[PDB]
Structure formats: structure tokens, C-alpha cells
Amino acid sequence: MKRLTYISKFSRPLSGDEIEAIGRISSQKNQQANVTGVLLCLDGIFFQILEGEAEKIDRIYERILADERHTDILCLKSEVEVQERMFPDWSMQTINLDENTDFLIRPIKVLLQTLTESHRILEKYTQPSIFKIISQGTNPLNIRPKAVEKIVFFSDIVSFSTFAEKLPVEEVVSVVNSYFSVCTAIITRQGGEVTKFIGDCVMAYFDGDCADQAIQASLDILMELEILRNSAPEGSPLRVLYSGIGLAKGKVIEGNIGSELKRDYTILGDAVNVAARLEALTRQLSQALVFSSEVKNSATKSWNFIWLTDSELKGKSESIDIYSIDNEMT
Amino acid sequence: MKRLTYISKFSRPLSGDEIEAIGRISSQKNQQANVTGVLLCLDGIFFQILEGEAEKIDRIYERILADERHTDILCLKSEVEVQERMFPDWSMQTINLDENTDFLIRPIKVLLQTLTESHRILEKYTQPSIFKIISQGTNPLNIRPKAVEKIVFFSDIVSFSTFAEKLPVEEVVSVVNSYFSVCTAIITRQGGEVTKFIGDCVMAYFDGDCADQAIQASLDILMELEILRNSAPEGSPLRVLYSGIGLAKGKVIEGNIGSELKRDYTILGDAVNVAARLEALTRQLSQALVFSSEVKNSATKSWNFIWLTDSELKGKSESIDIYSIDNEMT
Ligand SMILES: Cc1cc2nc3c(=O)[nH]c(=O)nc-3n(C[C@H](O)[C@H](O)[C@H](O)COP(=O)(O)O)c2cc1C
Ligand SMILES: Cc1cc2nc3c(=O)[nH]c(=O)nc-3n(C[C@H](O)[C@H](O)[C@H](O)COP(=O)(O)O)c2cc1C
Ligand SMILES: Nc1ncnc2c1ncn2[C@@H]1O[C@H](COP(=O)(O)OP(=O)(O)OP(=O)(O)O)[C@@H](O)[C@H]1O
Ligand SMILES: Nc1ncnc2c1ncn2[C@@H]1O[C@H](COP(=O)(O)OP(=O)(O)OP(=O)(O)O)[C@@H](O)[C@H]1O
Ligand SMILES: [Mg+2]
Ligand SMILES: [Mg+2]
Ligand SMILES: [Mg+2]
Ligand SMILES: [Mg+2]
């Protein structure tokens, strides 16, 4: 048995009648799927618990994400191997807390709103990776550090200083946020984890045996930015949004890093400086993407590799072979 | 009138009897101070609402922080200028939800635990500055970017690469976390805001007219690390924990930066690269602290300034006068 808890936001103002309609249909369909649960709403926020056979639940849940009347769905907990039903009497018990006024529910419905309002804000400042760990019943703070091989991704906007010196504050942030949004969307799509933003820089990493997906994310980013530049409106600052990209491979420490007040779940190691160094080299070369031979050697597909003879790196241990992809972009 | 909501963790296992004892005494003292509220507990978590005259509330609250039976106090909301009492009938109404079993409270007490467990984890990955903004009724995501003068603080561990190459993974993280903890404690104490950890680096900033407090935090850090090195156990890696420090002043953008999935409330601008550049210069000089003349010119106290003739900076616009403090440390 699987039990699923989640929360969402009202996509549009719903009346107490529309909510009841959802509960009724939900009750009918859950009655036949041998599913039980409870649906609660409070000042434009939905809360639902859903329990039953994992297969049947997976079906119902993915259909709930299709529902237009709510958005910002976030699953707080996914229990597997459950043996007991929390609410074996209710196929769907709807509880509109906005109308309930029992004196004992009053202190609890206030705290619930306060805790939820705060939670939904912390989400935006939190990495989506932590939420997945929490949902699985693992406390990410209790994770012990470990050494692991990763592909480190570094990309940095070209000559961002001029933007700040010639554009209003609102437009600079708009340019950098658009860039971060494009990078994050493609990296996450290829399995990458965006760990840190460093000024106008994106820091990310891939599994150590995923060099093909790091190269493909890099290439797709460069393609997306070229379409972005050519399709931007007239006089838009996005027309001159260029980036470099550097990829390196190496053994890094992954784990909780920081102080008692704040910490990050990120990586640490030499491969970070190499990736950063390589990204910087793109300013000198015509190629916007450069990577080490350990990345090139870890790829499984037959990329159009080009061997670059500009390995003037500093701070490393020995010589490093530099590579790029020879295509219309680079 | 002021209404105060907060949550805390049981410092030790409390029985339902000890809790009732807290409520009773709380009721007696709140009855005379014209104070009303509600105290709720759930699986080792306290929740309390407190409302009344701001002065009387401030007194009660600071005494509650003195109570040893709970810890990790975090105020979720501080309403000021309140006109209505939420619970005008209860000086202190205690509700032990662990024992309550009303069928209607059951779905709500589960969600409450799930939301709280998650919240308390997100706190550790969240900057304490966001929580203060949320408590005041301001949504930090709706804050618009602005240009502002700041003193940027940069400090970086000296030769951290050797630590990773010669110590087990657990001890490296222990060394960097101890360093981050020392830096954060002193910076926060002097009014500074620690915004980002960049590998073995601490990035922080001060108000633009607080150069004296940035210099004093820097000096105190260097003193703390010297005591840490001399007092460490035998063969401890903390004996060789050294840091550099760079301070710069300039106009930076402050605001929400990132993508739709994750964003940071941080700064951006040239002063960041200058502070980072200055910190790096300490590797060449005997002084562990260096700062620009704009920092030196913004100080109000009569520091023992020393004018450094090593302004070989790169990437800047023009020459930059370098300064340090001449004392037993540097
Ligand atoms: C917050 C929210 C919760 C919902 N929960 C359920 C549920 O638990 N079970 C269910 O069968 N449908 C649920 N639905 C509705 C489904 O998304 C979908 O509309 C329904 O299954 C399709 O109904 P139909 O059989 O008439 O096509 C929910 C919708 C919303 C907005
Ligand atoms: C979660 C928790 C909540 C408390 N809430 C209150 C309160 O609302 N009002 C109050 O007067 N004391 C409250 N106290 C107790 C005070 O911290 C303190 O012990 C008490 O005011 C001192 O009692 P005394 O007058 O016998 O010295 C609380 C203690 C704990 C652990
Ligand atoms: N060492 C650093 N550590 C952290 N953040 C930095 C550092 N240097 C710069 N930044 C941040 O990055 C922003 C852009 O600096 P950057 O070095 O990328 O310049 P640029 O004008 O974009 O040129 P380039 O083409 O060399 O990248 C700076 O305003 C600052 O916010
Ligand atoms: N450009 C960079 N951007 C972000 N993080 C970096 C960068 N370079 C290094 N790091 C991180 O910082 C860690 C330490 O690198 P760093 O350059 O500080 O070397 P170090 O051995 O501590 O020497 P130093 O005395 O020069 O500081 C690296 O392992 C990596 O985790
Ligand atoms: Mg740049
Ligand atoms: Mg940069
Ligand atoms: Mg270092
Ligand atoms: Mg460093």
C-alpha cells in the first residue's frame, strides 16, 4: 500500500460549491478503486491524503496533476510499504476549513495557515532536490558526506558588468534571471542538478558516468540562447546575452556544508576549479564550450570532437588536454 | 496590541503532566497581565499564540526563551497594531494533541505534523534573514531589486586543497564547517549578513556606512582562528587553519536572483569581484586582511592603518589604494 500527502494552490477562486463537487466525484471514483483519503482546503490551499494500492494511487495522482483548478503541487511525503489505512472509512472526506468554526479547530486552523504560508515561501528559496529527499522519509540533514565522481558544469555570462553599468536595476535582474531560467530548465531535463548561483554564473553537476548528457545540455543551452537572441524584441538587452561553458570530471565531496545557522547540500573538490578555469578560457577562444579529456573520454556517443591546443591552465597539477565540439555554434 | 506566534522543540521528553503544569502556571501569570493565548503540542513540538499589550508580551516572550524545557524557538509571525483578540476567553488554553483523538481532528493533526517536520528541515537550509522578513508580514519574494551601497566581505581558507587530499571525507567537512561556524558567528554579531558559501569561501556584506564593524569582525575572526589553532588537540587539522580576508565598498544590486525553481536573496555588482581579488592578494603579502581605500575612508574610528604598495590588481578600472591594519596579527 502507498500513502501520498501533497498540497497545492487554488488556480482560481473556487466556491464552496465547486469544492464539494470535486469531493463528490472524488468519492465516487475512489469508492471503486478501493482508495481512501481526505481533502482539506484553507484560504486557497488544498491538502489531500491518498492511500491504497500503489498502482491505483499512481494513476489517480497523475490525473490530479492534470486538473486545471489547482497548481503548485508539491508532494510532502510518499510512504511505501504501508500496512494500515489511516482513514479506512472515507473514500474522500472533504473538509472545507474556511467555513468550519468549531472553537477547538480555531487555534489549529490558524497555525496551519501560518505554517503553510511560510512553507510555500521557503520552497522558492529551496532546491527541488531537498524536497524529494524529504518526501521519501529521509532527513537530508542526517546524510553523511561522501567522495563521489561527478561532472561539474560551469557557465558564465559574457561581459555582464556592462549590463549593470548601462541598464536600470530591474532590467539587469530580468536578464540574469532569464539566463538562469534557461540554463536550469535544460540541465534539469538532462538529469543535472543546479547547486549554486555565483553572481552571473551557474554551477551544476552530473553523475560521473553521464558525460553525454552534460555535453548535450551544454549544446542545447547554446542553441536556446541563439534562438533567444535572434527572436528578442527590438532594442532588447537579450540580443547580446552570450555565455561560456566549462565541463570537468573528478572526485568531489558531496554533503551538507555550512554553519549551524545555514548550510547547503552541495559538492566540493578540485574538479570545481577546473571547470571554472575551463569556462574562463572560452573568452580567449572562438568556442563557447570547452571540457577536459576526462569528460571526452567518458562520453559514449560519437560526438564531433575537436582537440584544442590551448592548455595554458594555471593552478592545476599537470597538463590538461582541452576539447570542444565542432559545429555551427562553436 | 501585539500578537506573537512561534514554534519550538521539546528540549527533553515531557509528560502530559509537565505540560499541564506549564499551562496552569502560564494561565495564572497571563490572567494578571491581561494576556491571552493558546498552547499546542504535537509529537515533541510546541506551538503558541500570544496576544496583548506589546510591552507585556515582550516581557513574557523573552522569559519564555529562558525556559530550558524547549529549544529551537523560531517566531513565525509578529503582528503589531492588532485591534482584535483572537482568543479573548483564554489566558492560556493548553491543547495536547498527542492525546486528542476526535475523528475530525485526526486528518488535521497529521498534516500539521507533516508540514512542521518539513518546515523545520527547510529552516536549516534557509538564511535567518528571510525568516525575519516573513515574520514581519512581508513576503520576501515580492521585494523589488534596488541598487545600494554595501561593504562586501570575502574570506577564504588558505590551501584547502591539501586538506581534501590528505584527510578522510568526514574530517575535511568538519574543518570547513568549523571555519564557517566561526566566521558566521562573528559577522552576524557585528551586523553583517552572510549571503553565500562558495566552496571554502564565506561571502558576506555590511551596510555601506558600517566600515568600522566590518574591520572589527575581520580582526576578531583572525583572533578567533589564532586561539583555535593554539588550543586544538594534538595532531588536529585545525592547527593549520588559516584564512585570508578582503573587504571592498561599492554600489551593488540587492534582490531576488535565480530561476523559477530556486532563487537567492543576495547582492550583485563590481564590489564583489574587488573584494574577492583583494582576499586573493593576501596569499602574496604577510597581512591576512586587506581592504580598499573606500573602506578605509568610510571608517570613523582611528584604526592603526598601514598603506600597502601592492596594488597590482587585474580586471579593475583604474588604480586602487590597498590598506590593512598593522597589529600583532597581520
Ligand atoms: C485538489 C483536487 C483534488 C482532487 N482529488 C481527486 C481524488 O482523490 N480522486 C479522484 O478520482 N479525482 C480527484 N480530483 C479530480 C481529478 O483531477 C479529475 O478531475 C477526475 O478524476 C476526473 O473526473 P471524470 O471521471 O468525470 O473525468 C481532484 C481535483 C482537484 C482540483
Ligand atoms: C512552551 C513553553 C511555553 C510557555 N508559555 C508561557 C506563557 O504563555 N505565559 C507565562 O507566563 N509563562 C510561560 N512559560 C513559562 C515561562 O517560561 C516561565 O517558566 C514562567 O513564566 C516562570 O514561572 P514563575 O513565575 O513560577 O517563576 C512557558 C514555558 C514553556 C516551556
Ligand atoms: N570571485 C567572485 N566570486 C563570486 N562572485 C563573483 C566573483 N567575481 C565576480 N562575481 C560576481 O559575478 C558578477 C559578474 O562578474 P564577472 O567576472 O563574470 O564579469 P563579466 O562582466 O560578466 O565578464 P566575463 O565575460 O569575464 O564573465 C560580478 O558582478 C559579481 O556579482
Ligand atoms: N572558481 C571557483 N568557483 C567556485 N568554487 C570554487 C572555485 N575555485 C575553487 N572553488 C572551490 O573552492 C575549493 C577550494 O579552492 P581554492 O581556490 O580556495 O584553493 P585552496 O587550496 O584553498 O587555496 P588558496 O590558498 O588559493 O585559497 C575548491 O575545492 C572548490 O570547491
Ligand atoms: Mg560573467
Ligand atoms: Mg562570474
Ligand atoms: Mg582556499
Ligand atoms: Mg576558494
Side-chain angles (χ1 to χ4, degrees), chain A residues 1-260 262-309 315 320-330, chain B residues 1-260 262-309 315 320-330:
Chain A
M1 180 135 51
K2 183 192 263 232
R3 187 169 27 241
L4 210 86
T5 304
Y6 81 77
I7 56 154
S8 66
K9 167 189 134 213
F10 285 23
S11 88
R12 64 129 172 290
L14 289 141
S15 36
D17 324 291
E18 297 172 81
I19 294 153
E20 278 286 296
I22 290 156
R24 270 201 317 281
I25 286 128
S26 296
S27 194
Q28 293 164 27
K29 299 179 69 50
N30 283 359
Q31 270 222 333
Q32 84 190 12
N34 288 320
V35 158
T36 69
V38 71
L39 169 63
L40 289 94
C41 77
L42 182 57
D43 192 31
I45 313 121
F46 277 127
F47 321 73
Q48 176 158 226
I49 301 150
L50 250 172
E51 54 194 351
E53 226 73 56
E55 314 140 74
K56 307 261 72 142
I57 290 305
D58 283 341
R59 297 191 47 121
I60 283 135
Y61 182 65
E62 227 203 330
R63 185 71 63 182
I64 286 168
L65 324 158
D67 209 292
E68 177 272 279
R69 284 164 295 174
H70 70 158
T71 183
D72 300 270
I73 290 70
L74 186 269
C75 166
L76 297 202
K77 163 223 56 83
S78 170
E79 310 170 71
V80 291
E81 222 150 270
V82 167
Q83 61 138 99
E84 205 86 288
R85 277 209 209 270
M86 206 165 287
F87 326 96
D89 309 43
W90 310 341
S91 67
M92 174 88 282
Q93 184 67 244
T94 316
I95 315 181
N96 187 337
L97 284 163
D98 284 314
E99 313 199 271
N100 181 297
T101 200
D102 292 328
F103 98 94
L104 193 134
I105 312 276
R106 292 319 336 250
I108 322 193
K109 149 165 91 143
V110 181
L111 258 292
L112 167 57
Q113 170 145 30
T114 293
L115 266 171
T116 304
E117 167 86 280
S118 178
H119 197 275
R120 301 249 81 177
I121 287 161
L122 298 182
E123 298 170 17
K124 302 311 192 344
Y125 295 99
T126 295
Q127 319 144 52
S129 73
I130 316 200
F131 283 115
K132 274 207 325 153
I133 297 172
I134 299 158
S135 77
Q136 276 134 7
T138 304
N139 176 15
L141 298 136
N142 299 146
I143 294 180
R144 304 216 290 99
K146 61 214 145 293
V148 49
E149 289 238 38
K150 303 278 201 196
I151 291 146
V152 182
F153 169 104
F154 251 76
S155 68
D156 188 302
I157 298 175
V158 175
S159 74
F160 178 83
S161 288
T162 77
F163 282 99
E165 304 227 296
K166 315 227 165 101
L167 296 173
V169 174
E170 303 226 82
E171 283 227 87
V172 183
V173 168
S174 196
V175 162
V176 69
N177 282 354
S178 296
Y179 169 78
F180 286 163
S181 172
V182 165
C183 288
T184 298
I186 291 169
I187 295 161
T188 308
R189 188 172 297 131
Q190 296 292 343
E193 247 289 281
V194 179
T195 197
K196 191 111 56 193
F197 294 120
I198 306 161
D200 69 337
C201 169
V202 177
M203 177 177 163
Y205 57 87
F206 295 76
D207 283 340
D209 64 9
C210 292
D212 294 304
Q213 290 95 332
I215 293 169
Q216 183 62 241
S218 300
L219 292 170
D220 292 330
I221 277 164
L222 296 169
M223 180 177 62
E224 193 41 74
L225 285 174
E226 180 167 55
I227 286 142
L228 200 79
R229 281 190 303 268
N230 297 346
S231 78
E234 277 197 4
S236 164
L238 296 186
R239 178 148 285 103
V240 291
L241 177 60
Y242 296 89
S243 171
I245 302 177
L247 307 163
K249 180 175 197 270
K251 207 111 199 203
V252 295
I253 292 161
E254 188 176 24
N256 286 299
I257 294 151
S259 71
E260 247 302 352
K262 196 233 165 205
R263 71 193 38 141
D264 305 290
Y265 186 88
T266 190
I267 51 171
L268 249 170
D270 281 333
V272 175
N273 260 8
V274 179
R277 201 208 298 133
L278 291 186
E279 193 282 329
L281 312 204
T282 69
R283 306 295 191 277
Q284 321 297 162
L285 326 159
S286 55
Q287 290 87 6
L289 166 66
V290 289
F291 46 85
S292 73
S293 63
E294 289 82 8
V295 178
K296 172 249 159 72
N297 284 336
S298 267
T300 51
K301 319 281 270 291
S302 266
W303 304 96
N304 295 328
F305 292 120
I306 183 170
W307 177 30
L308 274 45
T309 78
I320 187 187
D321 279 307
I322 303 304
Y323 287 87
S324 180
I325 302 300
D326 180 12
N327 78 1
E328 63 265 15
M329 228 87 86
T330 50
Chain B
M1 180 135 51
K2 183 192 263 232
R3 187 169 27 241
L4 210 86
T5 304
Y6 81 77
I7 56 154
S8 66
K9 167 189 134 213
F10 285 23
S11 88
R12 64 129 172 290
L14 289 141
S15 36
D17 324 291
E18 297 172 81
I19 294 153
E20 278 286 296
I22 290 156
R24 270 201 317 281
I25 286 128
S26 296
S27 194
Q28 293 164 27
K29 299 179 69 50
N30 283 359
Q31 270 222 333
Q32 84 190 12
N34 288 320
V35 158
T36 69
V38 71
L39 169 63
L40 289 94
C41 77
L42 182 57
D43 192 31
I45 313 121
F46 277 127
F47 321 73
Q48 176 158 226
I49 301 150
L50 250 172
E51 54 194 351
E53 226 73 56
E55 314 140 74
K56 307 261 72 142
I57 290 305
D58 283 341
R59 297 191 47 121
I60 283 135
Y61 182 65
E62 227 203 330
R63 185 71 63 182
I64 286 168
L65 324 158
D67 209 292
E68 177 272 279
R69 284 164 295 174
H70 70 158
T71 183
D72 300 270
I73 290 70
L74 186 269
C75 166
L76 297 202
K77 163 223 56 83
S78 170
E79 310 170 71
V80 291
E81 222 150 270
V82 167
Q83 61 138 99
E84 205 86 288
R85 277 209 209 270
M86 206 165 287
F87 326 96
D89 309 43
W90 310 341
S91 67
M92 174 88 282
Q93 184 67 244
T94 316
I95 315 181
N96 187 337
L97 284 163
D98 284 314
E99 313 199 271
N100 181 297
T101 200
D102 292 328
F103 98 94
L104 193 134
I105 312 276
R106 292 319 336 250
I108 322 193
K109 149 165 91 143
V110 181
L111 258 292
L112 167 57
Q113 170 145 30
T114 293
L115 266 171
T116 304
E117 167 86 280
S118 178
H119 197 275
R120 301 249 81 177
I121 287 161
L122 298 182
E123 298 170 17
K124 302 311 192 344
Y125 295 99
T126 295
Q127 319 144 52
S129 73
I130 316 200
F131 283 115
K132 274 207 325 153
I133 297 172
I134 299 158
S135 77
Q136 276 134 7
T138 304
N139 176 15
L141 298 136
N142 299 146
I143 294 180
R144 304 216 290 99
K146 61 214 145 293
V148 49
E149 289 238 38
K150 303 278 201 196
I151 291 146
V152 182
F153 169 104
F154 251 76
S155 68
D156 188 302
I157 298 175
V158 175
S159 74
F160 178 83
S161 288
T162 77
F163 282 99
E165 304 227 296
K166 315 227 165 101
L167 296 173
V169 174
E170 303 226 82
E171 283 227 87
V172 183
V173 168
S174 196
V175 162
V176 69
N177 282 354
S178 296
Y179 169 78
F180 286 163
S181 172
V182 165
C183 288
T184 298
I186 291 169
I187 295 161
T188 308
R189 188 172 297 131
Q190 296 292 343
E193 247 289 281
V194 179
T195 197
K196 191 111 56 193
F197 294 120
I198 306 161
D200 69 337
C201 169
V202 177
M203 177 177 163
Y205 57 87
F206 295 76
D207 283 340
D209 64 9
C210 292
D212 294 304
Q213 290 95 332
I215 293 169
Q216 183 62 241
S218 300
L219 292 170
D220 292 330
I221 277 164
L222 296 169
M223 180 177 62
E224 193 41 74
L225 285 174
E226 180 167 55
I227 286 142
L228 200 79
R229 281 190 303 268
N230 297 346
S231 78
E234 277 197 4
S236 164
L238 296 186
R239 178 148 285 103
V240 291
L241 177 60
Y242 296 89
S243 171
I245 302 177
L247 307 163
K249 180 175 197 270
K251 207 111 199 203
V252 295
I253 292 161
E254 188 176 24
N256 286 299
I257 294 151
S259 71
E260 247 302 352
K262 196 233 165 205
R263 71 193 38 141
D264 305 290
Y265 186 88
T266 190
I267 51 171
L268 249 170
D270 281 333
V272 175
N273 260 8
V274 179
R277 201 208 298 133
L278 291 186
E279 193 282 329
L281 312 204
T282 69
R283 306 295 191 277
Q284 321 297 162
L285 326 159
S286 55
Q287 290 87 6
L289 166 66
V290 289
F291 46 85
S292 73
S293 63
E294 289 82 8
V295 178
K296 172 249 159 72
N297 284 336
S298 267
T300 51
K301 319 281 270 291
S302 266
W303 304 96
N304 295 328
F305 292 120
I306 183 170
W307 177 30
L308 274 45
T309 78
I320 187 187
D321 279 307
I322 303 304
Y323 287 87
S324 180
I325 302 300
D326 180 12
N327 78 1
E328 63 265 15
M329 228 87 86
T330 50

